[PDB]
Structures are given as structure tokens and as C-alpha cells.
Design a protein around this ligand. Structure first.
Ligand code: CDL
Ligand code: CDL
Ligand code: CDL
Ligand code: PC1
Ligand code: PC1
Ligand code: NAD
Ligand code: ATP
Ligand code: MG
Lengths: 54, 283, 70, 256, 120
């Protein structure tokens, strides 16, 4: 198991009715950032390929 | 947003919907429905004076929309039947506050789907359909049929007993007290404090064949919440005449505020002794 | 990672309890540029006003500690 | 209109949302095509990272405040808070408590300005869940084949018509608010599978929900309309009609 | 198709301005009591939450406490200068009363304070 090593502060759920505020950085922007990062890394590298098709 | 005078028995300890009648009134049409007399909780369940003061605050900072309607739908002609002194004060104060009242109209049907409320004017027999957003109704009573099959009630369906000794007209071995008794007074709880002393006495006298020397004067005391934190006492005798407490400190103030805290914070803890037996009635 | 950029909680850093240590290593490395410029006592002050300068001018000879006063 | 906008050409409606793990900014903005090695400048000049943070983080943040500067010009932010700060600043040397009481209304003013100048962000996942439940829309649109052609969402300036919304004719509310906190916009959609397009117009407003003081939903779609266009069929779908919605719920009237 | 990969299990909260909107403030917190008066109602109306209100009173409290500590330093003798002059002469009246009735040994030390009840 190298995806979820066991530590003490384990993830625990949250309940709407009982939660006042929260500070979290997770969002649902990773998919589109994955697509744009490919387009950037692909295009910015081809700048120095001098048109070498192979 | 339909609220009532008592809680259903299916609610758990975590359900506090009863307290959201005044809080959650952001907008819409509000109706306070009073059923046909006789009904339980005449003055002790009149909360249209405490909601008016709180809803006045909500109109000041925008919590309550400026286009909202609140009217009191009263099926009866008067608010306090057996005390015209207090009934005149209520209608006088409702006009000063600005609340609109519609008499001879009773709530008939509540449509939970589209929030429609079917009212009917018992005077003309004309029914109508009204949109509501905050509905409060005192639970209507119903005469029990077995008390009519045995020939004990009269007319409206209340016990036909003596106004003085609380003994029934016929069947002298049968008594009656509380709300089921037909007494020209307000059916309150403090009225029952002076009705149990008469019943426990007269019953004691019939078990020994002696005479009945216990008379019920018709005293009844109920607080009338005139503000969010102020009240006045509605106390009256059989002839509707009030005592030194009747309708005193009615316009608010320190005297009305102190009497409110004594009933709000220090009365519920006294009903534990009433049922156990530690504390008796007022006298 | 910048301490300033983590203050708004809008780039890459929401909770950083040791963000106030971010510039200690860079400031320490930049101070290493004067490692050889300021080496020893003579390069950090005006040496003729210090006691060791007197011992050197006396032929690396020990002097009483109050020699700068008499 | 998106308030946070840099010279970056791609993903304009996500620029404020995306939190990159970059140590500093990329040398160039995202290329729109393959370029030549001489198009870009090798070894960008000295103090380039500081310049990029000013023109890609600082400057567009100030343009956001300037674009929506009309939402912060209320008598509370303009006169009361600075007037309170000046009253205690005259006694700043008497004790420490005067310095705090003179700086708190400034920090309170910044927080109101910071929150009011942000882009209006509705819960878009609630919206897409709502349009994909309609059978007339799912006939021509699907999440796997839909694409965004244009997006616009901005607050409405000033107080609205004082007949459709009498709530905003409140002198106590006008002391803190110069706008109505309502927003309006549209969505130009297209389906690559069916070839259909639609303009999803919507109006939002804050509503109270289930509680006494807290707002229930800051962006509640009280009017939601779809003008679907197809090969030869033009349909008009009404998800939320304002004549039926405004009779049930009223705005919230934020204070502070 | 980003919404296809969106996880609806994050709908448990409605976060807006760092506050969960689905918070039962009518049953928990300072906003639970419905018997609040006009001042407390208008105060919760402005902030909409107890967490924001308590955070601001944290700093305003330090200012108010530090200000009243100064006003009682600069001023104060307007109300407390009488009780200090009263205790000043009282501190001298009982001192002189002690020297009259107290046992002093050959050096000036009251070595018998428990001689009688009036001496103690
Ligand atoms: C006229 C000439 C032409 C003019 C026009 C042209 C010029 C225009 C501008 C040109 C460029 C200017 C560069 C700056 C603007 C750039 C804009 C921008 O967006 O940049 C973002 C830029 C982007 O981030 P990045 O590229 O990823 O990384 C940036 C850095 O690599 C590193 O980033 P970092 O974030 O990691 O760095 C963090 C570091 C940054 O370094 C600093 O800024 C030093 C800060 C030290 C001062 C802290 C003060 C604390 C509060 C004090 C309050 C009172 C002050 C009174 C002062 C009186 C003075 C006697 O600060 C800290 O370390 C904070 C922690 C400090 C330790 C704890 C101290 C506080 C607790 C102790 C309290 C004790 C008292 C308690 C009780 C109090 C009583 C109640 O970040 C920057 O901030 C860049 C600044 C880097 C330095 C540039 C220097 C260039 C050389 C110019 C000469 C020096 C000028 C500055 C001198 C300042 C005075 C020392
Ligand atoms: C040698 C080279 C170096 C030299 C360096 C020194 C030189 C520096 C120069 C600085 C001056 C120029 C900069 C400003 C130019 C703006 C000109 C302009 O036309 O703008 C109009 C423009 C309107 O644009 P628009 O939309 O096209 O207008 C359309 C309609 O007209 C809109 O119609 P409307 O009806 O909606 O009206 C909207 C308008 C309404 O405008 C107004 O009605 C004017 C109200 C101003 C109130 C100021 C007094 C507040 C207190 C009064 C309370 C009185 C009652 C109580 C009395 C109690 C007494 C204790 O709103 C405003 O513009 C006011 C915004 C805020 C201004 C108040 C800031 C208060 C700062 C307090 C500290 C002052 C320190 C001064 C320095 C002296 C000591 C060193 O507004 C702006 O652009 C706002 C710009 C950003 C605000 C700047 C204010 C300063 C912010 C900096 C924060 C730090 C302040 C200082 C703190 C220092 C100590 C900690
Ligand atoms: C005295 C020395 C002074 C030295 C200098 C001090 C510095 C003075 C300058 C600064 C002034 C203080 C600034 C404080 C504000 C700071 C900011 C802040 O914290 O937020 C506001 C903050 C909010 O308080 P809160 O905790 O949120 O309120 C509680 C609930 O939240 C509120 O819940 P609610 O709103 O839902 O309901 C509230 C209330 C309902 O309240 C109301 O509705 C009444 C409102 C009526 C408004 C009427 C407006 C009238 C307009 C003016 C008049 C009209 C014009 C007249 C024209 C006349 C023409 C000439 O309902 C109740 O049931 C009340 C509970 C029971 C009463 C408790 C009273 C305790 C008193 C204990 C002392 C008794 C002494 C009696 C002696 C009498 C003779 C002196 O306000 C205050 O902090 C007030 C100051 C309290 C300080 C407490 C520490 C001292 C303890 C009291 C003194 C004890 C005696 C000491 C001396 C003993 C020997 C003599
Ligand atoms: C003479 C000295 C006193 C000057 C006046 C008082 C100024 C404050 C004292 C100086 C502090 C400087 C050192 C610290 C720098 C800030 C460090 C920091 O953490 O900031 C990050 C913050 C980030 O805040 P944030 O809200 O964006 O993100 C933080 C979120 N949490 C808290 C969860 C992490 O940015 C700031 O700069 C806040 C400080 C702003 C102070 C501004 C005061 C004036 C407000 C504007 C003027 C309003 C006038 C009226 C306007 C009328 C309408 C137009
Ligand atoms: C009274 C005289 C003036 C007083 C001195 C005022 C000094 C103000 C500048 C120093 C303090 C700046 C705070 C640094 C910490 C925050 C960094 C930051 O701003 O991030 C931007 C942030 C960026 O947002 P972000 O940090 O949350 O991240 C963006 C999100 N991502 C990464 C996903 C894109 O934006 C803002 O906070 C809003 C704008 C704040 C404006 C900052 C102050 C501008 C003041 C303009 C004054 C112009 C006149 C003076 C100069 C005139 C020419 C000489
Ligand atoms: N606001 C209200 O709705 C309400 C209701 C009840 C009591 N109260 C207050 O309490 C005061 C006195 O209340 P109360 O005792 O007169 O009425 P009550 O309803 O509280 O008491 C009736 C009791 O008799 C029982 N009962 C009813 N029908 C019965 C039947 N066929 N067979 C056997 N038992 C039957 C009930 O279970 C109940 O224990 C009232 O004056 C009033 O102030 C108010
Ligand atoms: N269920 C949640 N649990 C923990 N943190 C959350 C949760 N929801 C949001 N957050 C945090 O609060 C921020 C704001 O949430 P928000 O729903 O407004 O984002 P969003 O991108 O606008 O969603 P949408 O696309 O549906 O409009 C989020 O970036 C996240 O950091
Ligand atoms: Mg959003």
C-alpha cells in the first residue's frame, strides 16, 4: 500500500447541519487542469524542435 | 409553515419547528386562526401580540418583506367570551397595533401542495381559497358523543353542573370541573386550582352525607402576553368583574417586565411539584 | 514557496503553519556572500581601536588589557 | 464579466479558480500556436518573477476592485467606518485600545470590499443538475457532448424597480448597500453530437433559507430560460418562471 | 465533460464566505434562543453568524478593556477620591488606637497580640 499510508490523523467525514465553517483547498478543477497542462507542455516544447516532424 | 397550538406526539427531542413560527416569516400571507368556541387555550395561546413586536423589528432591517399580510381569522364574534373587560382591551390593542381581524370565519381545509387555505364565513356560509405562507391555528375541540348519550351535557356539549358547587343538575353523585364544565368563566388552569378545592370538598361531603359548603366564585387567571417580554394578567370573577390585577401594567414597563420573567423562567419548574404534590394551589 | 502568496489562501497554500520560516534559508544563503568579506575580527570593525591591534604592533607580544587607555 | 483577467488567452472563466502549484509564473503566457525559438526571449530579464506577480496577481486584482467599485460606495463604508477610525486615531497615543478601535473599522471595510468585488459565483453543479433533469433539454444536450461558447454573469447596479422589488426601498438597508446583490447573465451552449445550440438566460438573487439570520442561497435562479435552436426547430424552455417564483420567495437584503 | 467526473458527495456543505450555509443555527449556538430582544436581533441580522460576531468582539473587547483601564487611570478620582481619603484617616485612626491598647515589650514589638479580644 503506497496510496494511503496509515497515519493517526485519518480523514473523517463532515456533516452539513453541524459544520459552521471550513478551510479546504480541494476543488473539482483537476480534470481541466490536466487537459490544459498537456496542451501547454506539448506546445511549449515544440517551440524548440525546429519543425523536426520525427 | 403550518404551525399549531400543540406539538404532535411523533416529534423527537430534536424537533423545534414550534419555535420557527415567528422567526421564519420572511414574507407571504400570515393567518392566525381561532376555532369555534368552546376551544381550549383561549387567552393562554394568544401569541399575536408577541409576534407583532418581533415582526415590527423584521420590517425595520428588511428581514420581513414590506409586502406581507397578517390577519387574525376568528370564527367567533369575540376573543374573550365571559370577560368583556379583557375582550374590549384586546380589540382596542389590536387596532392600535394595526392588526386586521376577520370575524365569523373559520379555517376549514389546508392544502399542503400549493399552500392553499380554505376559509368559510360562517355568517354568510361563503367559503374562499387563500394563499398562505405562515399559518397558525388553535387546535379545535370536539364534543364527546358518550357524554351526550348519557344525558350529561347541554347544548354546546359541556357538562351541565351547578355554577356554585360544581355538582351536576341531576345525578348528584356526579361532578365536573376544568374545561368540560359549562361555567361562565375563562377555561384556564388557575381556574382549575379553585375548582379542585371545591370538588374535593363537595365529594368529601357526599361520602359522609353532609351538606355542600364549598362555592366556586368563578375566579380565573391567565397571563396575556402584550409584548415580547411583557405581559398583563387577565383575572376576573363569575360576573366578568376583574380584581386588582385585571389588565394592570398593560402598556409595558418594568412592572410588566418583571411579571413576565416570573412566568416565563419560573413557572414551568412549578408544574413538577403540582403533579408530584409538593406544592398546592395558590392559597 | 512564497510566504506572501500563501497569505490569501488562494494559491497552492491554504494551511501553512510554518510559512514564517520560508525566507530563513534564502536570507541565510544571501548572507553567505559576505562570508569571506567579513572574516575575522579586523574585517568587522576598525581594528586600530581594538586591543589585538596593539599586540601585533608590539611584535605579537602580550600587553596589559588596559593598554589602549594609558 | 470576469474581473480577474491576465494576458493569458486560455480559460478566462477559470483564471480566478485555478490554483497552480507554480513556484513562479511561466516565462511566457500560454501559447496559442507553436512558435519559433527566437519568438520568446531566452533568460527573461532580472526581477522577472517580481514583475510577473504584479501584472498577473496584483494588477488584475486591482482591476477587479475597480470594475466593481460601485458596489462599495455606501454611506457605511464611505463615511461611518472612516469617520469612526478618525475619532479613535486622535487618541492613538493615549493607550493601545485606541489604536485597535481605529484600525478595526478599516479591516472591516476591507473585508466588505474584498467580498463584494469578487466575481459572482453560483453553484454551477446545481445548475447543470437542473438542466439535465429536463427532458426537453436532454433531447439535444448531454454533459459528454456539450461545450461552452460564451459565459456572462455580473451583478446588477443600483436598486431595481420599486414595484417588482419593494424590499430595497429600505433606508436602513440602503445605508449599508448601494446595489441589490442580484446578478444576471446567460450561457451560450452547443452540442457537438446533435448540432443544437441554446442560450440559457438566468436571473439570480439571494434568498433566506430554513434559518433566521443566515442567507440560504446567495444565487437562487428565480428566472431560468432556455432558447434552444436546432436544425429547423426553435424551442423555448422555461425551467423557472419569475412570475411564479417571486410569489413564493423574496430577496434576502444583505447587511454588512 | 468535467461535470461527469464531479463528485456529488461534496454537496454535503454549501460553502460561501468560509461558512457552511446548511448550519442549524436555530438549534445550536447563540442564535438558538428565540427570546432575544431588538438589540440582539439586529446584531445577529448584521453578521448573520455567531462565529463572525465573536471574532470581532475578541478585538473590540481588548480595546474597550484597555480604554476603560485608561479612563480609570486618568480620571477615577471623580468617584473614588472620597473612599481613599476615608481609608487614609481610617488607616491612621486605628493605628493610633493600637498604640493606646497594646502590650509593647522593652523593644517596640507587640509580642502579646492574643492577650485579649480587643488586642487581637
Ligand atoms: C525610486 C526607485 C524607482 C522606484 C520605482 C521602481 C521600483 C518598483 C518596484 C520594483 C520591485 C520591488 C520589489 C517588491 C515589489 C514586488 C511586488 C510583488 O508582487 O512581489 C511579490 C513577490 C513574489 O513572490 P516570489 O517571487 O515567489 O518570492 C519572493 C521572494 O523570493 C521571497 O518571498 P517570501 O514571501 O518568501 O519572503 C518573505 C519575507 C519577505 O521579506 C521581507 O519583506 C522582510 C520583512 C521584514 C519586516 C517585517 C515587518 C513586520 C511588521 C512590522 C510592523 C511595523 C513596521 C515598522 C518599520 C520601522 C522600521 C525601523 O518576509 C518574511 O520573512 C515574513 C516573516 C518575518 C519573520 C517574523 C517577523 C514578524 C514577527 C516578529 C514581530 C516582532 C514584534 C512583535 C510586537 C510588535 C509590537 C506590537 O514577493 C515579494 O514580496 C518580493 C520581495 C522580494 C524582495 C525584493 C527586494 C528587491 C530589492 C529592492 C530593495 C529593497 C526594497 C524592499 C526593502 C523593504 C524593507 C526591508
Ligand atoms: C510627492 C509625490 C508623492 C505624493 C504622495 C501623496 C499624494 C497622494 C494623493 C492621494 C489622493 C489621490 C488618490 C485618490 C484619487 C481619487 C479621485 C477620484 O476622483 O476618485 C473618484 C472615484 C469615483 O469613480 P466613479 O465611479 O467614476 O464616480 C462616479 C460617481 O461620481 C460616483 O458617485 P457616488 O455617489 O457613488 O460617490 C462615490 C464616491 C463618494 O465620494 C465621496 O463622497 C467623498 C467621501 C470622502 C470621505 C473622506 C472622509 C471620511 C470621513 C468623513 C466622516 C465625516 C462624518 C463624521 C465626522 C466625525 C469626525 C471624527 O466614493 C469615493 O470615491 C470615496 C472612496 C473612499 C474615500 C474615503 C477614504 C477615507 C480615507 C481616510 C483617511 C484619509 C487620509 C488622507 C491623507 C491625509 C493624511 C496624510 O472613486 C475612486 O476612484 C476610489 C479610489 C480608491 C479610494 C481612494 C481613497 C483612499 C484609499 C486608500 C486607503 C488608505 C487611506 C489613507 C489611510 C492613511 C492612514 C492609515
Ligand atoms: C458604571 C461605571 C461606569 C464607568 C465607566 C465605564 C465606561 C462607560 C463608557 C462606555 C460604555 C460601555 C460600552 C460597552 C459596549 C462595548 C461594545 C460591546 O461590548 O457590545 C455592546 C454590548 C452588548 O452587550 P450584550 O452582552 O450583547 O447584551 C446582552 C444580550 O446580548 C442582550 O440580549 P437582548 O437584546 O435580547 O435583551 C436585553 C434585555 C432587554 O433590554 C432592553 O430591551 C432595554 C432597552 C431599552 C432601550 C431604551 C432606549 C431609550 C433611549 C434613551 C432615552 C430616551 C430619551 C430620554 C429623554 C430624556 C430627556 C432628558 O433583556 C434582558 O432581559 C436583560 C437581562 C437582565 C438585566 C441585566 C442587567 C444587569 C444590570 C446589573 C447592574 C444593576 C445596577 C442597577 C442600578 C440602577 C441605577 C444606576 O453592550 C454592553 O456591553 C453594555 C455594557 C455592559 C458592561 C457589563 C460590565 C459591567 C456590569 C454592569 C455594572 C454592574 C454595577 C457596577 C457598579 C455597582 C456600584 C454602583
Ligand atoms: C500608521 C500605521 C497604521 C496604518 C493603518 C493600519 C493598516 C494596518 C497596519 C499595517 C499592517 C502592515 C503589515 C501587515 C501586512 C498585511 C499582512 C497580511 O496578512 O495581509 C494579508 C491579507 C489577506 O487577506 P484575505 O482576506 O484576502 O485572505 C486571508 C484569509 N484568511 C484570513 C483566512 C487567511 O491582505 C491584507 O492586506 C489585509 C490587511 C488590509 C489592511 C487595510 C487597511 C485599510 C483598508 C482599506 C481602506 C478602507 C478605507 C475606506 C474605503 C471606503 C470605500 C472605498
Ligand atoms: C495611504 C497611502 C497608501 C498606503 C500604502 C498602501 C500600500 C498597498 C500595497 C502594499 C500592501 C500590499 C499587500 C501585499 C499582500 C497581498 C498581495 C496582493 O495584493 O495580492 C493581490 C490579490 C491577488 O489575489 P490572490 O492573492 O487571492 O490570488 C489570486 C488567485 N489566483 C492565484 C488563483 C489567481 O488581489 C487582492 O488581494 C485584491 C486587490 C488588493 C490590492 C492591493 C493593494 C493595492 C493598493 C493600490 C495603491 C495604488 C496607489 C499607490 C501606488 C501609486 C503609484 C506610486
Ligand atoms: N391550549 C390547549 O389546547 C389546552 C388543552 C388542554 C388543557 N389546557 C389547559 O389546561 C387547563 C385544564 O385542562 P383540562 O384538564 O380541563 O383538559 P385536559 O385535556 O388537559 O384533561 C383531560 C384528561 O381526561 C382524559 N380524557 C379525555 N377524554 C377521555 C375519555 N373518553 N375517557 C377517559 N379520559 C378522557 C384525557 O386523557 C386527559 O387526561 C385548561 O383550563 C387549560 O388552561 C390547554
Ligand atoms: N463539501 C465541501 N467540503 C469541504 N470543502 C468544500 C466543500 N465545498 C467547497 N469547499 C471549499 O469551498 C470553496 C467554494 O466552493 P464552491 O461550491 O463555491 O466552488 P465552485 O467551483 O464554484 O462549485 P460550482 O462549479 O458548482 O459552482 C471550494 O473551492 C472548497 O475549497
Ligand atoms: Mg461556482
Amino acid at each position: 500500500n503506497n496510496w494511503h499510508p496509515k497515519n493517526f490523523n485519518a480523514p473523517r467525514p463532515s456533516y452539513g447541519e453541524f459544520t459552521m465553517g471550513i478551510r479546504c483547498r480541494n476543488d473539482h478543477h483537476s480534470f481541466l487542469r490536466y487537459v490544459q497542462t498537456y496542451r501547454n507542455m506539448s506546445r511549449h516544447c515544440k517551440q524548440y524542435f525546429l519543425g523536426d516532424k520525427q | 409553515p403550518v404551525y399549531a397550538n400543540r406539538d404532535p406526539e411523533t416529534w423527537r427531542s430534536a424537533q423545534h419547528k414550534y419555535s420557527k413560527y415567528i422567526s421564519n416569516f420572511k414574507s407571504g400571507d400570515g393567518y392566525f386562526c381561532i376555532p369555534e368556541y368552546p376551544y381550549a387555550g383561549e387567552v393562554e395561546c394568544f401569541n399575536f401580540f408577541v409576534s407583532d413586536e418581533v415582526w415590527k423589528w423584521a420590517q425595520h432591517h428588511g428581514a420581513l418583506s414590506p409586502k406581507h399580510t397578517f390577519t387574525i381569522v376568528n370564527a367567533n364574534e369575540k376573543f374573550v367570551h365571559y370577560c368583556d373587560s379583557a375582550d374590549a382591551f384586546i380589540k382596542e390593542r389590536l387596532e392600535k397595533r394595526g392588526i386586521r381581524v376577520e370575524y365569523n370565519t373559520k379555517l376549514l381545509e389546508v392544502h399542503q401542495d400549493g399552500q392553499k387555505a380554505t376559509f368559510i364565513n360562517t355568517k354568510t356560509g361563503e367559503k374562499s381559497v387563500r394563499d398562505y405562507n405562515n399559518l397558525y391555528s388553535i387546535v379545535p375541540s370536539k364534543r364527546q358523543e358518550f357524554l351526550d348519550k348519557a344525558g350529561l351535557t347541554n347544548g354546546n356539549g359541556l357538562l351541565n353542573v351547578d355554577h356554585q358547587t360544581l355538582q351536576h343538575k341531576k345525578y348528584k353523585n356526579i361532578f365536573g370541573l376544568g374545561d368540560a364544565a359549562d361555567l361562565p368563566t375563562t377555561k384556564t388552569f388557575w381556574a382549575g386550582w379553585y375548582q379542585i378545592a371545591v370538588v374535593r370538598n363537595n365529594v368529601k361531603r357526599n361520602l359522609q352525607g353532609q351538606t355542600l359548603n364549598a362555592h366556586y366564585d368563578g375566579f380565573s387567571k391567565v397571563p396575556l402576553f402584550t409584548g415580547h417580554q411583557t405581559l398583563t394578567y387577565v383575572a376576573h370573577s363569575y360576573g366578568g368583574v376583574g380584581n386588582w390585577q385585571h389588565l394592570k401594567h398593560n402598556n409595558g414597563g418594568i412592572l410588566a417586565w418583571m411579571r413576565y420573567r416570573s412566568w416565563a423562567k419560573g413557572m414551568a419548574k412549578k408544574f413538577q411539584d403540582f403533579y408530584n404534590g409538593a406544592r398546592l394551589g395558590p392559597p | 514557496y512564497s510566504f506572501v502568496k500563501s497569505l490569501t489562501h488562494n494559491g497552492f497554500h491554504m494551511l501553512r503553519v510554518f510559512r514564517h520560516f520560508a525566507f530563513v534559508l534564502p536570507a541565510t544563503v544571501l548572507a553567505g556572500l559576505g562570508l569571506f568579506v567579513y572574516w575575522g575580527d579586523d574585517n568587522k570593525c576598525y581594528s586600530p581601536d581594538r586591543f589585538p591591534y596593539l599586540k601585533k604592533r608590539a611584535g605579537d607580544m602580550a600587553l596589559p588589557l588596559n593598554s589602549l587607555n594609558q | 464579466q470576469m474581473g480577474f483577467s491576465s494576458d493569458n488567452p486560455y480559460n478566462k472563466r477559470w483564471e480566478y479558480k485555478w490554483k497552480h502549484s507554480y513556484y513562479t509564473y511561466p516565462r511566457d503566457y500560454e501559447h496559442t500556436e507553436v512558435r519559433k525559438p527566437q519568438d520568446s526571449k531566452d533568460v527573461p530579464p532580472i526581477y522577472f518573477a517580481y514583475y510577473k506577480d504584479f501584472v498577473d496577481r496584483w494588477l488584475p486584482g486591482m482591476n477587479m476592485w475597480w470594475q466593481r467599485r460601485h458596489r462599495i460606495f455606501d454611506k457605511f463604508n464611505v463615511y461611518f467606518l472612516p469617520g469612526m477610525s478618525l475619532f479613535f486615531y486622535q487618541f492613538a497615543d493615549l493607550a493601545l485600545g485606541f489604536k485597535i478601535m481605529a484600525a478595526f473599522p478599516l479591516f472591516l471595510a476591507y473585508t466588505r470590499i474584498r467580498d463584494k468585488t469578487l466575481d459572482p459565483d453560483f453553484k454551477e453543479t446545481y445548475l447543470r443538475d437542473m438542466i439535465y433533469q429536463n427532458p426537453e433539454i436532454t433531447k439535444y444536450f448531454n454533459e459528454e457532448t456539450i461545450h461552452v461558447l460564451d459565459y456572462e454573469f455580473e451583478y446588477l447596479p443600483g436598486y431595481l424597480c420599486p414595484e417588482k422589488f419593494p424590499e430595497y426601498q429600505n433606508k436602513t438597508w440602503q445605508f449599508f448597500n448601494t446595489d441589490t446583490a442580484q446578478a444576471e447573465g446567460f450561457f451560450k451552449f452547443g452540442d457537438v453530437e446533435s448540432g443544437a445550440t441554446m442560450t440559457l438566460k438566468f436571473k439570480t438573487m439571494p434568498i433566506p433559507g430554513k434559518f433566521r439570520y443566515q442567507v440560504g442561497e446567495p444565487f437562487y435562479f428565480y428566472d431560468l430560460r432556455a432558447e434552444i435552436k436546432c436544425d429547423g426547430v426553435y424551442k423555448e424552455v422555461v425551467l423557472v418562471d419569475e412570475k411564479e417564483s417571486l410569489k413564493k420567495i423574496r430577496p434576502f437584503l444583505f447587511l454588512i | 465533460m468535467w461535470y461527469k467526473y464531479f463528485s456529488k458527495q461534496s454537496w454535503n456543505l454549501r460553502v460561501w464566505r468560509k461558512a457552511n450555509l446548511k448550519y442549524n443555527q436555530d438549534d445550536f449556538g447563540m442564535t438558538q434562543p428565540k427570546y432575544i430582544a431588538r438589540f440582539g436581533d439586529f446584531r445577529f441580522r448584521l453578521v448573520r453568524t455567531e462565529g463572525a460576531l465573536r471574532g470581532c468582539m475578541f478585538f473590540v473587547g481588548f480595546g474597550c478593556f484597555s480604554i476603560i483601564n485608561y479612563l480609570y487611570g486618568r480620571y477615577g478620582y471623580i468617584i473614588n477620591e472620597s473612599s481613599q481619603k476615608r481609608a487614609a484617616q481610617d488607616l491612621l485612626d486605628n493605628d493610633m488606637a493600637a498604640d493606646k491598647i497594646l502590650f509593647k515589650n522593652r523593644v517596640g514589638a507587640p509580642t502579646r497580640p492574643l492577650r485579649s479580644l480587643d488586642d487581637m
